[PDB]
Structure formats: C-alpha cells, structure tokens
C-alpha cells in the first residue's frame, strides 16, 4: 500500500500500537484511582484530582502516538483494554506506589521502543519519543517520588492525620 510510508518498519509500527494500548490502559487505571479517592468513605479530593489529571495526560499520550502512526503511514490497531489491576487502591501511599510502578513500566516501554527505533535507524521515531515522552515521563516519575517521600514522612504513628495533611497541603485542588 502506502503512498507516504518511508523508513517505517513493521516492527516499529506494531510496537507503536502496543504502546498506545499501554497508555490507554494506564489512563484507565488512573480513571479508577481518581474515582476511588472520590468515594464518600475515602474522600481525598486532592488525590482524586491528581489521578484524574493523570488519566487525561495518558490519554493524550496515546492520541499523540496514534497521530504519529498516521503521519508515518502506519495503521492503528486497537486491542482490548484490560481493566485495572485493583478495584480498591488502599491508602494514598499504596496508590502512589502503584502509580510509580505503572509509570516505570511505561518508561521502560518507551525506552524499549526507542532502542527498536535506533536498531531500525528510524530517527524520526527516536526524536518523537525524546521530544514528547521521555522527559515528560522522567519529570512525572520525579514528582511521584517527591510525593512518596512526603507521604512516607507523614505516616509515623498518626497515619490518618498525615494522609489528610498531604492532601490538603501538597495536592491543593
């Protein structure tokens, strides 16, 4: 087929489609996190908003990947989105630990795709990742680490008070 496709391997095309799925899955996980913290029996508004905003960011990442797939002459292929790994997400610390784990997996997927692009001598792909994804992900993971540290400092032996304060004073809504 393609009238525009140039220097775009089938391997990169398929890996782009898989990364789309991983970003949409991450978005869905964040949607679940966001609504869990909005429960009347959890009620941590700032935490909810933090995860809700991440759901939006990850959907935007997927949409940028899809746009690029079309710009390169590849074909978007969608698969099922697996529901999130938990139905209830525990404390803010549990949730932030789960978020960092999820982000490290996305980062590793970005790094794996970058390596594939280098192997395939696909500099456009390499640039696209560098310019829209790699630093954004490093910044986000740093912010989550900063949060985890502050959450952990606040646990002590008065965990409720610390969880309230973090939400009130770090994650202002």
User: Which residue of 12, 19, 50, 114 would you call a contact of a second copy, by CB under 8 A?
Assistant: 114
| CA angle centred on 85, ends 80 and 89, rounded to 5° | 140
Shortest Å, Cβ 101 to Ru ion: 25
Residue 94 binds a second copy (CB under 8 A): no
Residue 142 binds Ru ion (CB under 5 A): no
Task: Find out whether 167 is annotated in a ligand binding site.
Answer: no
Query: By C-beta, is 11 or 28 nearer to a second copy?
Result: 28
Shortest Å, Cβ 17 to Ru ion: 19
| CA angle centred on 165, ends 88 and 147, rounded to 5° | 65
Tally Cβ neighbours within 10 Å of residue 173.
11
Residues numbered 11 to 70 that lie near a second copy (CB under 8 A) are 24, 28, 31-32, 35-36, 38-43, 45, 63, 66-67, 69-70
Residue 83 binds a second copy (CB under 8 A): yes
Residue 136 binds a second copy (CB under 8 A): no
Residue 45 binds Ru ion (CB under 5 A): yes
Instruction: Give yes or no for a contact between 31 and 91, defined as CB atoms under 8 angstroms apart.
Output: no
Task: Find out whether 163 is annotated in a ligand binding site.
Answer: no
Could you give phi then psi for residue 61, rounded to 5 degrees?
Answer: -60, -50
Residue 8's nearest CA partner among 69, 54, 63 is 69
Distance CA 92, CA 48 (A): 10
Could you give phi then psi for residue 55, rounded to 5 degrees?
Answer: -60, -40
Interacting span for Ru ion (CB under 5 A) from 25-33, 54-62, 99-107, 115-123: 115-123
Could you give phi then psi for residue 79, rounded to 5 degrees?
Answer: -125, 175
Residues numbered 150 to 169 that lie near a second copy (CB under 8 A) are 150, 152-158, 160-166, 168-169
Task: Find out whether 88 is annotated in a ligand binding site.
Answer: no
Which parts are annotated binding residues for Fe cation?
53, 56-57, 60, 63
């Amino acid at each position: 087929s393609s009238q525009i496709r140039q220097n775009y391997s089938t391997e990169v095309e398929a890996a782009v489609n898989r990364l789309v799925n991983l970003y949409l899955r991450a978005s869905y996980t964040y949607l679940s996190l966001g609504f869990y913290f909005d429960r009347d029996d959890v009620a941590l508004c700032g935490v909810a908003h933090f995860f809700r905003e991440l759901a939006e960011e990850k959907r935007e990442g997927a949409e940028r990947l899809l746009k690029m797939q079309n710009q390169r002459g590849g074909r978007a292929l969608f698969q099922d989105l697996q529901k999130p790994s938990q139905d209830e997400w525990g404390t803010t610390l549990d949730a932030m630990k789960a978020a960092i784990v999820l982000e490290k997996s996305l980062n590793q997927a970005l790094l794996d795709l970058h390596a594939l692009g280098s192997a395939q001598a696909d500099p456009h792909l390499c640039d696209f990742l560098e310019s829209h994804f790699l630093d954004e992900e490093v910044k986000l993971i740093k912010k989550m680490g900063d949060h985890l540290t502050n959450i952990q400092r606040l646990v002590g032996s008065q965990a409720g008070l610390g969880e309230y304060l973090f939400e009130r004073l770090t994650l202002k809504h």
